[PDB]
Amino acid sequence: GRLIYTAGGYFRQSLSYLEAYNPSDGTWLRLADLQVPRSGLAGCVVGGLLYAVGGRNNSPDGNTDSSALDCYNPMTNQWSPCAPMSVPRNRIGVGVIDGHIYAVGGSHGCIHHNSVERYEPERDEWHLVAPMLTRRIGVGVAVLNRLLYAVGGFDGTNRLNSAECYYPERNEWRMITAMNTIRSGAGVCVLHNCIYAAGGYDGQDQLNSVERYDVETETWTFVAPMKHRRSALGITVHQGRIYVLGGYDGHTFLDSVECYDPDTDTWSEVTRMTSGRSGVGVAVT
Amino acid sequence: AFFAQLQLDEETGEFL
C-alpha cells in the first residue's frame, strides 16, 4: 500500500532522516538520508516521485537557507538533485497542479518572501509566477479544483488569519475569507474537497484547534481539535484520513503522530516518530 | 561580528 514519507526536520540541529510509516501495520522503515540536512522544508509527490523543497540547514557550524529541490524514488531508494529555485525558502509551503510544483513564500535570512515559482519536472526548470498579496513564511499551502491556496503564516511583523487563492490561467492572486484563528506554522492540506488548517502558533500559544474551508459556502468551520497543540508540524493525507507529524509546542519537540478520521470527526494518536522533531516535510506515495 | 548568543524561534523551536 502507499506509505507516509517524512523527510528532514529539527531537534538540536536540522536532520537528514527519511523514514516511511506504514499505517496498515504501524511499522517505520529508515530509508536513504537526505544528501544535505534540512528543516523548514516541504514534501510533495509528482508521478510517484517524492520531492524535498527548500528549508535550511541550521547546524552548530552555522545556518544555510536552501534553494534546493531534491527527488527521492521510492522504487530505487536513490535521491537525485534537481534544478534549484531562484531563491532560498525556509519555512516554504508547496502545492502541486497539473504535475507542476508550486514553491510559495518562505524566508531567506530576514527576507519574508511574497514570491512564488513553478517547477516543471519534464523540463527540470523553475519559472517565477505572480507574487502573493502578502509575504508569508510558515505558510500552509493546498490545491483545490486546480486553484492554489496560501493560508496563514507570518509576514515579518504579524501572524496572519488571512488566506489567498491563486488562479493559474489568470496568473492572479485574490484574498478569500480569513480563518477564524490567527495561525502561523499550521499544517494545511485538502481532504474531501475542503482545505484543513490544523494547529499553528498565534504569537502567544501553540494551537490544537482545527478548522476547514469550503469553497461552496466560502466559510471556515471548526472540527474536532487535535489532542496535542503544535506548530511547525508536517501534515498529509493517506487513504482519506489526515495525519499530523511532530512539531513544537513551546516546551518540547513532538514525536506524536495524530490521525483525523473525517467520518467520525475524531483524532487519535496512532504512532510516534522514532524521535521528536519540528519542521519536517511529508508526502504520501 | 560579536558572537552573539542564539535566540529561540517560538514557532519552530530552532535556535539561531
Q: Which residues of A touch B (CB under 8 A)?
A: 10, 39-40, 58, 63, 91, 138, 154, 184-185, 201, 231-232, 248, 250, 253, 278-279
Identify the closest residue of chain B to A200 by CA–CA distance. Answer: B11
Cα–Cα distance, A230 to A9 (Å, whole number): 14
Cα–Cα distance, A267 to A230 (Å, whole number): 14
Experimental approach was X-ray
Which cell is A137 given? 513564511
Domain extents in chain A: 1-285
Residue in A63, A231, A253 nearest the CB of B11: A231
Identify the closest residue of chain A to B13 by CA–CA distance. Answer: A248
Q: How many A-B residue pairs are in contact by the CB < 8 A criterion?
A: 34
CATH homologous superfamily of A1-285 equals: Kelch-type beta propeller (2.120.10.80)
- Name, in order, each residue with C-beta under 8 angstroms of A78's C-beta and a sequence gap of 6 or more: A32, A72
**Do A234 and A281 form a contact (C-beta atoms < 8 A)?**
yes
**Do A210 and A238 form a contact (C-beta atoms < 8 A)?**
no
Nearest to A31 by CA among A66, A79, A69, A71: A79
- Name, in order, each residue with C-beta under 8 angstroms of A161's C-beta and a sequence gap of 6 or more: A152, A178, A179, A180, A181, A182, A183
Shortest Cα–Cα distance, A208 to chain B (Å)? 14
Mind spelling out the 3-state secondary structure of A185-232?
Answer: CCEEEEECCEEEEECCECCCCECCCEEEEECCCCEEEEECCCCCCCEC
Shortest Cα–Cα distance, A157 to chain B (Å)? 14
Which cell is A168 given? 493559474
